[PDB]
């Protein structure tokens, strides 16, 4: 995020980091319950990547994080990578996350819910702060 | 480029698809929602994470960080997967697995 700010640690408890074998953060995701993470289809996750929950500072060794294996990747059949449309994947975890103050689920909408133009929302992540 | 060690956040507004098309044209589909163009931008490494909106005391996943400006321009809207268009697929996948 360009021109954002640092979060309060633990205050976005559904935010996960998707990391490869080397520990490299390549995408975010959101816990929707103890067993499932929602992410983008174009992140290209497989069962060799891991979901890291409970993190704030990826340079710190002193956080009690959960490094969670992925059992199965469910890329939505409707995903069109050429138009980047329907850009959603579900990750089923091999072993459940342990919910805590810093690890818990985001809510999902109903299909009919209205989110009006002009509403102020929030996005979070470890993406670049400067291009 | 600069990658942060610590988790970042930003507040940003939702756009309409009709208005978002003034930036992105026919690239904008019904299963996308645009947000930003407000002085912040999602950027490389944010993809897959949340766009959440608060109502009735709780945060709901409205978007999934997807794509946008190749330079993470803060005056161009970011494009997010529109969760309302995708949630029926989510709930089913959970319940079947």
């Amino acid at each position: 995020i360009v021109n954002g700010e640092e979060a309060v640690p633990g205050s976005w408890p559904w935010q996960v980091s998707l990391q490869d074998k080397t520990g490299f953060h390549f995408c975010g995701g959101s816990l929707i319950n103890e067993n499932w993470v929602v992410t983008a289809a174009h992140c290209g996750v497989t069962t060799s990547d891991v979901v890291v929950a409970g993190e704030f500072d990826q340079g710190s060794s002193s956080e009690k994080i959960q490094k969670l294996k992925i059992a199965k990747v469910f890329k939505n059949s409707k995903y069109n990578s050429l138009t980047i449309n329907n850009d959603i994947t579900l990750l089923k975890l091999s072993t459940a996350a342990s919910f805590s103050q810093t690890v818990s689920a985001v809510c999902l909408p109903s299909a009919s819910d209205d989110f009006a133009a002009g509403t102020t929302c929030v996005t979070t992540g470890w993406g670049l702060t400067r291009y | 480029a600069n990658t942060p060690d610590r988790l970042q956040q930003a507040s940003l507004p939702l756009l309409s698809n009709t208005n978002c098309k003034k930036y992105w044209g026919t690239k904008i589909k019904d299963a996308m929602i645009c947000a930003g163009a407000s002085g912040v931008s999602s950027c490389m490494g944010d993809s897959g994470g949340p766009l959440v909106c608060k109502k009735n005391g709780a945060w709901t996943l409205v978007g999934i960080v997807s794509w946008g400006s190749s330079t993470c321009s803060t005056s161009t809207p970011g494009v997010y997967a529109r969760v309302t268009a995708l949630v029926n697929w989510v709930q089913q996948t959970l319940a079947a697995n």
Binding site: H42, G127 | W24, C43, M44, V65, W67, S69, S70, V79
Partner: peptide, 5 residues
């Protein structure tokens, strides 16, 4: 110019 994020 569009790009995956």
């Amino acid at each position: 110019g569009s790009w995956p994020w």
